[PDB]
Structure 1
Amino acid sequence: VSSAAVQWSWDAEFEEVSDDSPEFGQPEIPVKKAQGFVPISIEALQDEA
């Protein structure tokens, strides 16, 4: 959740205030995947060191 700050103002006596509602926003971060693969022979897995 993200937002901003209220904007005050300098007002005289008997002066109507202004609408100072803030504005919110929401960041979004999707999650992705990575993979790696390497096969091997049964022969090499026994012979190789």
Structure 2
Amino acid sequence: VSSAAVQWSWDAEFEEVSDDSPEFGQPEIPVKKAQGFVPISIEALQDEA
């Protein structure tokens, strides 16, 4: 959730106020994945060191 402040004002006596309702925003963060593969022969596993 993201928002801001309320905007005041220097007013006089007997004067209406200004509508100061703030606004919002929703930041969104999708999640992604990465990959990596290594195939190897049976002979290599039991021969190489």
Do both proteins adopt the same fold according to a TM-score greater than 0.5, normalized to the shorter chain? Answer: yes
Residue deviations 1:1-41 (CA, integer Å, cap 9, x gap): 00000000000000000000000001000000101000100
Secondary structure of 1:14's aligned partner: coil
Percent identical pairs in the alignment equals 100
Q: How many pairs were matched up?
A: 49
Tell me the TM-score normalised to structure 2 length. Answer: 0.98
| Higher strand proportion (structure 1 or 2) | 2
- Structure 1 distance, partners of 2:14, 2:40, is 84
Report the counterpart of residue 27 of structure 2 in structure 1.
27
Q: What does 1:1-49 align with in structure 2 at a 5 Å threshold?
A: 1-49=1-49
Give me the CA root mean square deviation: 0.3
Instruction: Give structure 1 regions of 4+ aligned residues with deviation exceeding 2 angstroms.
Output: none
